[PDB]
Amino acid sequence: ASEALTMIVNLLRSQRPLQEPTVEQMRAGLEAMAQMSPLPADVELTTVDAGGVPGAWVRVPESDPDRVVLYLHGGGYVIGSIRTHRDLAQRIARAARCRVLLIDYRLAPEHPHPAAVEDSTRAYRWLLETGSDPKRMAIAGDSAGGGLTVATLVALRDAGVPLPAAAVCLSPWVDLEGIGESMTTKAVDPMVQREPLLRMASMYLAGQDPRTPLAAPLYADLRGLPPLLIQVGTAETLLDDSVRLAERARAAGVQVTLEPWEDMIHVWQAFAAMLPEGQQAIERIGEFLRQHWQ
Ligand SMILES: COc1ccc2cc([C@@H](C)C(=O)O)ccc2c1
Ligand SMILES: COc1ccc2cc([C@@H](C)C(=O)O)ccc2c1
Ligand SMILES: COc1ccc2cc([C@@H](C)C(=O)O)ccc2c1
Ligand SMILES: COc1ccc2cc([C@@H](C)C(=O)O)ccc2c1
16 A cells, blocks of 8 residues: 555554543544645535535536535544535545535434434435436445445435435445444554444434444345445455445345455545545546446
């Protein structure tokens, strides 16, 4: 892997807090980390009300406005914002030559499950309402937002809503009990530890069964989902979330591409400004999306 990978891993290991962070400290910490990736001058961000869910359109000069990704940010269903994920969104808009609708879906512990899935499905329905064509749409997201991408598809399908052309999961989180083999064997992963992840799961579930399918889509019915790209790093505690998801989706007849990136860490694409493999993974997202929009 690139020398940049070892630099990022060493920085993250050195900066991990010595006391369990509060929700406020985690939100502020991620906002601080995301402010170090500055927004290129050619990115246009437009604040919008996505049918009752706050959002921002993200586009670049080469964006085809008829092509839309609904982007669901990560953060354990507890942290993250339009500001934390706007760099990943603009990189995807640029590679996929599309616009991205980034939504500020409701977060736990203030708004437990199923508020996040209510917001993602409402935003998608609003895109169809305002004239977006499912054949030129995709849903994408990272970690919690990768889990929420699968849950959103399941919930739309069950409601009889037309599904988009494709979906993209970046290091998806689909097992809210952390019982994947890698959630032990990969403990090489400086940003996802079992205990804090299960703390975020507890806040999202608010006493609901940790196998509730729209919260933990490892237990959802995935039949009829559109083509799925899963990008995951081999140095991830969530590796076996992506492996188990691919297995389940393929068994349900979904056209799955599982891309395991050797030695990559959790949502390495978020570090694309300085990590070559992060930009290379985002170019591959753009290629996958344009292939399914043809
Ligand atoms: C800047 O470097 C880090 C690295 C890992 C982190 C992990 C957490 C959470 C999951 C935690 O440790 O409870 C928070 C901040 C962090 C900051
Ligand atoms: C326990 O107290 C802390 C101390 C530092 C923290 C830093 C972060 C940021 C930088 C992060 O998310 O990486 C978050 C929570 C934190 C909590
Ligand atoms: C450098 O900029 C970032 C921006 C967002 C990030 C988000 C994550 C996790 C919490 C996520 O997938 O939401 C990690 C690193 C990140 C780095
Ligand atoms: C505490 O650990 C880190 C490590 C790498 C980081 C890289 C970025 C920028 C340059 C990025 O690649 O987007 C920001 C925060 C970071 C925090």
